[PDB]
Structure formats: structure tokens, C-alpha cells
């Protein structure tokens with residue numbers, strides 16, 4: 086589970102600062118600082134007015150961003166789907182048989198040499 | 207399952223009355239009484255126009271609410287995720303191999319003690 | 323699974339015609355006929371502008387409806403949650419190892435009798 | 446899992462070009478080219494302002510689109526539900542131990558023949 090939440094809370098951080106690089110000059114509403122690039126991306130993440138409210142409007146300026154928004158969403162929904170489903174899995178549902186065998190082998194090397202040793206005789 | 211729905215339907219109640227303390231000064235639309243602080247939070251909970259419709263606007267006035275909304279949502283989605291997943295779990299839900307080998311070993315010590 | 327989709331596609335039908343009784347007076351946009359009471363409820367079901375777009379506005383007129391919308395949503399999301407989860411359940415819910423071993427045993431009863439042979443008939 | 450993502454990323458492609466046939470006359474905002482028929486459908490797929498923002502407005506012109514939007518959504522949500530649930534299934538519900546045993550067997554055929562190799566050593 087929470088071995089993905091590090092990935093995610095860097096993705097969040099990663100994308101945010103591109104958006105703050107790109108947009109703050111013309112959408113300081115949403116992207117002037119991390120302080121709301123987070124909010125924004127949090128909201129984008131959430132799928133309330135991501136396109137019509139944020140993106141379509143971002144894109145009237147920068148078609149550069151078309152993907153920023155589609156990309157972020159796919160990834161965001163995946164790396165949550167991935168973590169979300171890693172709590173149905175890691176909530177609901179072998180090397181004491183390498184230790185069984187890899188001495189059961191040492192038991193047959195012991196026998197094959199305690200037979201080979203009973204051979205010279 | 208429903209041992210969480212008590213927690214949830216207090217969280218709902220909890221957050222609502224802060225919001226009615228805070229906002230039902232300047233957003234009596236949404237937060238003047240519980241009567242729509244519930245609705246509002248229900249809608250916030252639901253993620254239809256939570257930010258753009260409610261929060262961003264709440265926050266144009268009070269930036270201390272910034273978190274109220276983000277906090278509520280995280281918790282809300284969790285304590286539903288927790289209860290939701292407590293109905294996949296609370297709806298749905300060997301030594302033979304070791305025995306086969308750990309006497310197959312005792313069979314080869316038996317054989318290897320075939321000695322003079 | 324589909325023993326609930328009858329319940330659901332009656333709930334849909336049920337609620338719609340109350341809404342068409344109630345509202346297709348004053349919200350014939352959304353509730354004038356089933357033809358968009360369905361759409362509307364489908365959209366309400368979907369949680370795009372259910373409140374701000376449909377309900378808060380329905381309710382400026384009829385506070386009667388406050389619940390219509392909250393009630394429908396709870397039930398709707400449930401009787402889908404119920405059917406949705408009835409396709410994780412009604413979709414979902416070590417032999418070669420016992421054939422490896424249970425002749426590897428027959429190989430060692432073979433050896434312990436191919437030695438019971440020849441220690442004994444050697445010396 | 447990804448044997449459905451081909452179906453889906455054709456459904457996406459399929460519907461888009463009907464929408465571009467139909468609408469990129471009168472809704473070139475959303476449907477003038479694939480370049481935003483995709484976006485649009487992506488956004489429709491996502492359920493942000495699909496009805497109120499896109500469809501209800503598409504349909505003020507063409508009521509034959511009524512279904513285009515309801516149909517796409519049902520299918521879209523299904524063929525994602527189908528693929529989504531194909532990663533709970535194909536995630537939830539051992540050949541360095543067929544190489545352990547199937548030479549540990551070849552070790553006991555070796556021994557049973559290096560014992561039967563003083564069995565032929567009486568004859």
C-alpha cells in the first residue's frame with residue numbers, strides 16, 4: 086500500500102511546479118504558487134471543473150497544457166487506482182520450503198557419499 | 207461495516223457546525239444553518255462544485271477554510287473508503303506440503319542409516 | 323448480479339414519475355416528461371451539477387424536493403454499489419507438487435528396497 | 446487486463462468520429478476535429494459538465510445525440526468497470542522449485558543407479 090503513496094506525493098509535487106512554471110504568469114489564480122497549484126491539482130485530481138473551469142481556460146492561452154491536464158489525470162487516477170486497489174488486496178489476501186529442500190538436498194549428498202564411501206569397501 | 211457509519215455520521219455532524227460557526231455570517235447560502243450545512247457538506251462530500259462552486263468562493267473571504275474543505279474531503283473519502291471496503295470484506299470473507307517433505311526427509315535419514 | 327438491475331431500473335422508473343408529477347409544472351426543462359426526467363435522474367445519478375444545476379434550483383421553489391434529491395442519490399449509489407460489487411463477487415468467488423513428491427516418495431521406497439536388496443545380497 | 450484496453454481505445458476512436466461527423470458543424474468548440482472530440486469525450490468520459498456543459502446544449506440542436514451521450518457513458522463506464530475490475534481479479538486470483546525437485550529426482554535416479562550400480566555388480 087503506502088510504498089506507492091511516496092510516488093504519488095511526488096507526482097503531486099512534480100506536476101505542480103511545472104504548472105507553476107508554465108501558468109503563474111497567466112493563471113495566478115490557479116498556478117501562481119504551489120499554495121494553490123496544489124489545491125488546483127487536488128481539485129483537478131478530484132474532477133470537479135477540471136476542464137471547463139480550469140483547463141479549457143488554461144488552454145485558450147496555452148495548448149501546451151492540453152496534455153498537462155489529460156496526462157496528470159490519467160496518471161493521477163492510475164496511481165490512486167493502484168494504491169486504492171492495494172488496500173482491497175493488501176487488506177483481504179515459501180522460504181520454509183527452500184529450507185526444506187535445500188537441506189533435503191544436503192541429505193541426499195550425504196547419502197550419495199555414504200554409499201560412495203561404502204563403495205571403496 | 208456499520209460500526210464506522212456512526213463515526214461518519216458524527217464527522218458529518220462535527221464539521222457541519224464548525225462551518226455554521228464560521229461561514230453562516232458570509233455564506234448563509236451554504237452555511238447559515240445545519241439545514242444546508244448538511245446539504246452543502248453532502249454536496250462537498252459528493253464532489254460536484256465543491257471548490258469552484260463552494261470553497262474557492264468561501265476562501266475568497268476566509269483562507270482559514272482552505273483546509274476545512276480539503277481536510278473534510280480527505281477524511282470523508284477515507285471514512286467512506288473504509289466503510290465501502292468494509293462491505294467487500296464483510297460480504298466476501300499447506301501444512302500438508304511440509305508434512306510430505308518433513309517425513310520424506312525422515313525416509314532418507316532412514317535410508318542413509320541403511321549402513322554397515 | 324442482474325437480479326438487482328430489475329430493482330434499479332424500476333427505482334429509476336419510480337422516482338422519475340414522482341419528479342414528473344412534482345416538477346414538470348415549474349421545471350419542464352428537467353421534469354416535464356419522463357423523456358428528460360430520465361436524462362435528469364441519469365445525470366443526477368451521475369453527479370454532474372445535481373445540486374447547483376438541478377436541485378438547489380428545484381428547491382428554491384419546492385423544499386419538498388430537498389429530500390427527493392438526497393434520497394434518490396443515496397439509494398441510487400447504494401443499488402449500484404450493490405450491483406457493482408455483485409460483479410467483483412459474482413465474477414471472482416498446487417497439484418503438480420503432490421505429483422512431484424508422491425512419486426519422489428515412490429522413488430525412495432524403490433531405493434530403500436533396491437538396497438534392502440544390495441546391501442543385503444552383497445555382503 | 447490490457448486485452449480490453451484495445452476495445453476501449455477503439456470505442457474512444459469510434460464514437461469520436463461520429464461526433465465529429467454530427468456536431469463539428471454546430472459545436473466546433475467540442476466536436477470540430479478529433480483534436481477536441483477526444484478531449485470532449487475524455488471529459489464526457491470523466492463526468493464533469495457532460496450534460497449541462499456539453500450534451501443538454503448539443504441536444505438543444507440535435508435530439509438524436511441524446512443517446513450518443515447516454516450510450517457513450519454506459520459503454521465507457523462499463524468497458525472501464527470491465528477493465529478496472531480486471532485488475533482486482535488479474536491482480537489477486539514457482540519454477541525455481543520445479544528446478545529444485547526435478548533434479549533432486551535426477552539425483553535419486555542417480556543414486557538408485559549407483560546402488561543398482563553395485564546390483565549389476567553381482568552379475
Ligand SMILES: [Ca+2]
Nearest residue numbers: 253254369370
Ligand atoms: Ca461533478
